[PDB]
Amino acid sequence: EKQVKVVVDRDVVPTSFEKWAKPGHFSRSLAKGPKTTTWIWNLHADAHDFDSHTSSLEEVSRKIFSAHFGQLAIIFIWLSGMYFHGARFSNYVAWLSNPTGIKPSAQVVWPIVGQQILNADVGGGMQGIQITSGLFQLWRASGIVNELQLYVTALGGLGMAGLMIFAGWFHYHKAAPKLEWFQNVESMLNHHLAGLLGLGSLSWAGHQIHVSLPINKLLDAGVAPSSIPLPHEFILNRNLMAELYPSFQQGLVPFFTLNWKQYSDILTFKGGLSPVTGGLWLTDVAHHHLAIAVLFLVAGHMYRTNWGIGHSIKQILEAHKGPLTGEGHKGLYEILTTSWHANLAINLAMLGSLSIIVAHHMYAMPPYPYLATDYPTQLSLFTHHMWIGGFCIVGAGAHAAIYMVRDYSPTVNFNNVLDRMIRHRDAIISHLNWVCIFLGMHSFGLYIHNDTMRALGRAQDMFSDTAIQLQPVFAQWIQQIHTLAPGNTAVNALATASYAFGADTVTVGSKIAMMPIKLGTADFMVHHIHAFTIHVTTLILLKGVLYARNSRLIPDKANLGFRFPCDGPGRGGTCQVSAWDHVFLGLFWMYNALSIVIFHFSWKMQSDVWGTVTSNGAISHITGGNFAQSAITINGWLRDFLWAQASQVIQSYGSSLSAYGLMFLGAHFVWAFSLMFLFSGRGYWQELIESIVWAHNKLKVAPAIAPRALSITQGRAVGVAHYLLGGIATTWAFFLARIIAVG
Amino acid sequence: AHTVKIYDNCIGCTQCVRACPLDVLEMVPWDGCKAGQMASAPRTEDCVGCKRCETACPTDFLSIRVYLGGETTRSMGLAY
Amino acid sequence: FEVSDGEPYPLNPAVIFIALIGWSAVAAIPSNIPVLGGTGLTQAFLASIQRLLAQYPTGPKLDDPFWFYLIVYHVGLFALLIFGQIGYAGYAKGTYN
Amino acid sequence: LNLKMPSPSFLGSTGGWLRCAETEEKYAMTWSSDQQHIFEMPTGGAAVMNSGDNLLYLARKEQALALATQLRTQFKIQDYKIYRIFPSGEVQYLHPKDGVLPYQVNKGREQVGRVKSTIGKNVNPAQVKFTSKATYDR
Amino acid sequence: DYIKPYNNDPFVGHLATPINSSSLTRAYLSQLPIYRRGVSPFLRGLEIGMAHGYFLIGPFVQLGPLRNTDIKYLAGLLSAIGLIVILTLGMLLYGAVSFTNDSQDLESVDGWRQLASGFLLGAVGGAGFAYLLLTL
Amino acid sequence: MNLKKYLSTAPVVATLWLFLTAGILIELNRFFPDSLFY
Amino acid sequence: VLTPCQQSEAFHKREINEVRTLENRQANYEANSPSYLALQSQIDQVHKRFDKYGTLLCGQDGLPHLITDGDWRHAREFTIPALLFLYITGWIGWVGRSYLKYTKETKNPTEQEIILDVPMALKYMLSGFLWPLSAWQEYRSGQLLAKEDEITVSP
């Protein structure tokens, strides 16, 4: 039994500006003076690498706890900024009065160089830039009706940021916990499961029951936002809550008497989207938060902490052992308690996967009101969370490789799952590479074959609905099962979880909110393309992590480090052999996969879901059924999607969307500038810099800091950074301009 | 079959031999420096061209130069 | 039978029999739900098998309930088989946890 | 030498020597230890070196030398010998080839591959054109 | 414990896993036209070809460009025969460069030539048999 | 506690100087907009 | 051919088009309310800008074309801004060169380059207001151009 106690060191680090005037103080090599321009880049490259600074785990743990506080403060400042922008420079009240007619906007551009044109006529009196972040819908779902609440929330956010600033400084210069702290994974998990998530969802459920539910009910009943009672009135005067929800007449007595069924007025399970706003029923959302809170709270009492009751993660890990895995998960507990890189890899992979799942679930089941009708917001949110998820996944792979190169130990990883995997890494990577080849052929080859057939006039020999058909029978079957679930497998559910599986369509403000997303041959091919790209990117990352320590080409890659340029022009060439380079390649592949994924979502939504509905139910999509026969060929993807939909971003000049068009061009430049750093080497730039330095010497204007070219690894990093920035910015401007100009 | 050549500017610091991963270099007695030792490459057949020695050489201009010439199984670093 | 190289592997048909009987009995519990029609999934699955066997050439289409019964029955039966072999070899034969 | 020497307790792995090593060169490393240390095999994995004599086979000289480097660094083991075995069966002593580490100056070694003066005196490629001579050749 | 080195000797680039090596796996990999004891190269080639052409005809007849015409089976059979001829050409080239003059043991020029002849004859016969079955 | 030296470092001095330059340019552009051909 | 914009119909047409574009959006708003005043200021600025540009030369497209041949009549178009740019950038270059020359005289010039010496940096920045004159006398004294520098093989 180990005491889960708190031990801290007081005044461990002094608070002074002495170290601010000595850049590179955290590194022994960087504290001796630059001597070259490469030191400037190395200073920032190794600034947040706390593991390279010192060899003590305690110091790294403290440098992480702090700086986590700093990032939390940065997030709180950003949130406060969003709330203040909504309260001061946004048409939030006007939007509340007419959510469908008024375009959300919370940014006002200053009139200086003709940029005042960017202030679009979003309505509501004010003119500004239309925001697609969903801030307006979220605030409405939270019960915000006046800008005073937005101002108070902004002030509270600023205060929380100040608190997260003080906490970060206090936990590094006034009270720094010892390594025994931070190694209590059982206590940290129990608290995060029952306090950070469990109690958090419980509190949010309470807020929704007492604020979101009544305010939104009155809003959806035709009551003006100014005439709705204040949130505190619903708590003080129980008569109002009783009138809006008779369940409140019984009070909390039913909860304590197990007569939970009496809460059918506030805790419903309707299942579908609200026909008035198009979003999920707030009652179902509150009931969902209550259930997730109770489930997380119960889950938070699993591990053992300072008491006999509970579980030991190490015991559970070591208990799992089988014939095909000699030692099972033995030694993994010590791995996740002595290396922050391993924990960061697992957490980054899970956080990225969670973000991707969030994107899918948010578009399919619009949670906020009027979110579905605001297609710009829907496109931006799905695409945004999809991108952040992919970036976090690539980062997860990078940190896994980092741990493998630096924190790995043969004694700890002996005959366990990790060691057993490293033993047969060749089978893993060759079989996975074979899967990638098969997927690419059977996914992209289908598209290429269709291009060849259509060009030859042999349309009868294509992979389409009319010609050879490839129907996702399994996915279509799951959709049908979901369509029939509300009556045979969900007895208490009154409607399908998502109308995208089937049921009927929902229209709000003469606009389609969510209708069944039928899958055909085009969806079959695109889904296989998605799987192919995911397989190749995971192959690149897994290869980099498995061979991070050694390989048949370089027997001691670990000694060379995780981030090294190459072993030289030997053994035929060992360029981009380090794991860091594998992450560098995985970034491009993740970008390609994610770009294709967002492209499919955008086109499919604009051709089969998003659109207008005329009286009597007639439906007219933005691109009427063109995805069925145009998404099956690369030519169609270039003509009906990249060319047809780009007209909005190229013709945006002279209007409020001109900025997007400008960003559309700028991004291209950046994407084309990255090529400079990707198809070139530092030897040539060093020679060019030598000639330029001679020119400077001829005028006695040479700098003391010897100018040097970017390192090989730094050059690769700059190239990938510019490539991703340009590509994501181009598709960002294209998506936003296309969705704002139409729909 | 890469050609490794040692020049007279060698200071006998042994860093090239210490950084060579194929036992291609060694130290032999010499009288051109106070160290009394000079780098030698009597096993160039095992060299792969990684140039770790070139990187580990401290002289102004590398006293050890590796020229990539004939390619064989050893030089290609093929374990298959 | 040898699972790998010269190491023997204990195969017991009783494992399959016990897994099949246990899963059939567990799935034979009636449920007044429209998909199952007031009977266990085992009875419904067997009934669907007979119905589809009558029309041997034509197989079940996407809207046929047979697929749901098949997936659930196989999910549970395979789970009992896998967990059953784990329990028999790991504990009964001494292969260890 | 001593092909019957005991081998470290390893559980296989898929990174060991392939068929090419059977029909071609195959390196071997034989070292002695006093404690059953755990070392990372150059092929990927973890092994326990038998207390006493340890003998293992590899497909590359660099792999054996890297293993020797880690045995000398992670552990204070300096009596590591690397041999080469051909398909015919004749063994060849490769490392250290003289009982002394290469970076340790030792008598009896003849300088090989020496060029007079610095590289700045190398002849131009035009002066040795159409001839079996190189710039580094004096 | 089931995963062991292939030859019980570590440091080998292979592992004796369940499907990799097992009673059932060793029996199945063995006895095949190839790897079976007491089978001449021509017999192995004949069996392999008659087993390959049979399933090779299927794709061409079912999804060939002329799959909808009345000569879909004939066109597919001709396509399969052509593919078989190309494969036989590849086999013969491989035997010509990889193997030298020695005893006929499937690893010599004569052995691989006999194997290629058997493969071609078997593949053509199998394709013809499958075509006959489809027509009937 | 030498804050002056830190404020004198390359990033801080560069950002301050560029901020002042941009501010001067912007202020000149609103007081004297669409300036062309002097 | 080029004609003054004040006498070109294309220029007036463009001015009217811009005014119309602004007025179309201005009509939606109300006289005294947020916005509508924002568009009136833009219209006034458009009028002033076109009246200012009327002196420039433009062809058929009506876009003001700038003559850079060096004609005195068009000095304000390119000559004057060109000279002012050269003065500003020569000032920047000369102050930078002098600061580097001073830093090279310190104990650790690298530290000065990283952590700029605001006192001396400002001392050289404030000066140099006569950089064209300072460039000379440095050249005449031979303190500007160097004699021997770093050169690789095959000079």
Ligand code: CLA
């Ligand atoms: C962390 C989440 C959270 C938080 C902070 C709150 C916070 C609050 N809730 Mg609440 N609530 C939540 C979640 C949450 N809730 C959830 C998940 C549910 C289920 C969906 C409810 C359902 C609920 C109801 C129905 C009510 C509240 C009420 C309240 C407020 C007073 C509670 C109270 O003590 O009254 C105590 C009330 C009692 C009846 C005490 C029970 C025992 C008494 C002593 C019986 C003995 C008889 C006696 C004579 C009293 C007669 C009462 C009878 C006439 C009803 C309070 C600010 C109450 C309120 O103020 O409405 C605005 C209210 O009626 N909540």
Ligand code: CLA
């Ligand atoms: C799926 C059915 C099932 C389940 C859940 C179990 C579970 C268990 N068996 Mg058992 N067994 C089964 C079938 C099953 N058995 C059958 C059919 C046979 C006959 C051959 C046996 C014969 C057998 C023997 C001889 C022994 C066991 C023993 C055990 C226990 C040892 C640990 C273990 O096996 O792992 C599982 C441990 C758990 C705690 C369960 C965790 C489950 C996870 C969290 C979720 C599983 C979801 C699952 C896949 C859902 C499937 C779909 C569903 C519709 C069925 C364990 C609690 C041993 C024992 O008695 O304990 C000492 C032992 O001696 N079993």
Ligand code: CLA
């Ligand atoms: C129920 C108790 C509890 C709660 C609610 C939290 C909550 C949190 N912890 Mg934490 N932790 C706890 C107990 C708890 N912890 C214990 C007992 C240990 C030791 C075993 C740890 C050790 C620990 C570490 C090492 C780290 C965290 C981190 C975090 C943050 C994760 C980042 C995030 O998701 O943003 C969500 C943010 C919010 C929702 C804002 C809420 C913030 C308020 C102030 C609630 C937190 C209360 C705090 C735990 C205790 C107050 C102390 C009091 C003296 C003032 C989050 C705020 C990480 C972090 O970010 O570092 C700062 C991290 O590095 N925790």
Ligand code: CLA
């Ligand atoms: C919670 C997420 C998280 C965290 C905490 C870390 C933490 C860390 N990472 Mg990691 N990483 C992450 C996510 C994360 N990473 C993701 C998502 C990726 C994929 C992109 C990576 C890929 C990655 C690599 C390849 C490496 C690290 C490294 C490191 C370590 C040193 C970082 C450093 O000092 O560089 C300093 C940081 C900078 C100099 C900033 C670079 C700026 C880039 C270009 C982003 C620009 C964004 C911005 C929006 C651009 C537009 C604005 C522009 C116009 C100005 C450190 C412990 C390095 C390491 O382990 O050391 C060996 C390492 O090599 N990370």
Ligand code: CLA
């Ligand atoms: C968009 C693609 C692109 C661009 C813009 C450039 C641009 C350039 N290349 Mg180049 N190149 C490219 C692709 C590109 N290349 C590719 C694919 C290859 C094949 C590998 C090459 C290989 C190559 C070689 C071998 C060489 C060049 C050279 C040059 C420079 C030539 C001199 C010049 O015109 O300077 C003018 C500067 C510009 C055109 C850049 C515009 C100015 C920027 C935007 C201003 C500064 C940033 C600004 C403040 C905004 C950022 C703010 C910040 C907060 C983010 C120039 C900067 C030559 C060179 O070095 O010249 C001396 C050189 O020898 N390139």
Ligand code: CLA
């Ligand atoms: C890689 C994607 C792909 C796929 C799936 C297809 C598929 C097809 N193409 Mg096509 N094609 C492609 C790419 C592709 N093509 C590209 C990129 C081009 C442009 C160069 C073309 C140009 C093209 C033309 C001009 C034509 C076709 C035609 C056809 C059809 C008949 C082709 C045929 O008879 O092949 C023969 C196939 C085989 C001999 C064998 C296939 C492999 C077998 C089935 C794998 C079995 C493995 C097995 C499961 C392993 C385990 C077994 C073991 C354990 C026992 C067919 C549906 C024809 C048509 O009319 O369209 C309908 C036609 O005229 N294609």
Ligand code: CLA
């Ligand atoms: C950095 C260069 C710079 C320069 C050279 C100027 C110069 C000038 N500004 Mg200006 N300003 C700047 C930056 C600058 N500003 C910035 C970054 C902002 C914020 C976006 C402003 C906002 C601003 C406003 C609102 C006004 C001026 C005005 C003026 C003129 C008034 C006369 C004067 O001599 O005051 C010299 C002023 C300065 C040297 C700059 C001081 C700016 C301080 C911080 C005041 C701004 C307070 C702000 C509203 C709230 C807090 C800001 C925060 C940074 C602390 C003037 C010549 C006034 C004007 O239009 O004249 C009729 C006026 O109304 N400025």
Ligand code: CLA
């Ligand atoms: C003391 C500052 C300084 C001075 C006096 C010069 C002067 C000169 N440079 Mg140079 N340069 C500088 C900084 C400076 N440079 C920096 C920081 C860079 C890296 C971006 C370069 C990169 C550079 C290249 C690539 C080339 C020159 C070239 C030249 C020569 C021709 C003009 C030219 O092309 O300029 C070009 C100027 C730039 C590309 C950017 C200048 C950067 C900023 C805006 C100015 C420096 C500000 C400095 C920090 C001020 C210090 C003030 C001090 C009091 C604190 C000329 C003698 C050319 C040459 O080789 O000669 C024929 C040439 O090709 N420079």
Ligand SMILES: CCCCCCCCCCCCCCCC(=O)OC[C@H](COP(=O)(O)OC[C@@H](O)CO)OC(=O)CCCCCCCCCCCCCCC
């Ligand atoms: C066969 C029925 C499963 C349907 C296939 C999809 C299952 C999804 C899980 C993925 C892993 C595959 C399951 C076998 C794997 C499995 O569970 O085996 C069983 C075994 C686990 O049993 P142990 O006795 O080792 O248990 C002890 C430890 O697990 C302690 O928890 O796992 C292995 O040791 C081998 C791991 C992968 C072996 C290589 C297979 C790689 C192929 C991956 C592709 C899978 C098929 C793709 C879909 C068509």
Ligand SMILES: CC1=C(/C=C/C(C)=C\C=C\C(C)=C\C=C\C=C(C)\C=C/C=C(C)/C=C/C2=C(C)CCCC2(C)C)C(C)(C)CCC1
């Ligand atoms: C993957 C898979 C599989 C597969 C299977 C198979 C594939 C089977 C079979 C089979 C086959 C693939 C067969 C074939 C065949 C053929 C035959 C049976 C034939 C024949 C005969 C004849 C009639 C002949 C004739 C001739 C002539 C005419 C002359 C020349 C020579 C010869 C002899 C050729 C399984 C189910 C396992 C599992 C799952 C899936």
Ligand code: SF4
């Ligand atoms: S210099 Fe560049 S190309 Fe050459 S070996 Fe190194 S990383 Fe590879």
Ligand code: SF4
């Ligand atoms: S190139 Fe590499 S292998 Fe060859 S001598 Fe130099 S260090 Fe040794």
Ligand code: SF4
């Ligand atoms: S070649 Fe270089 S590293 Fe080797 S001994 Fe001579 S000077 Fe030292």
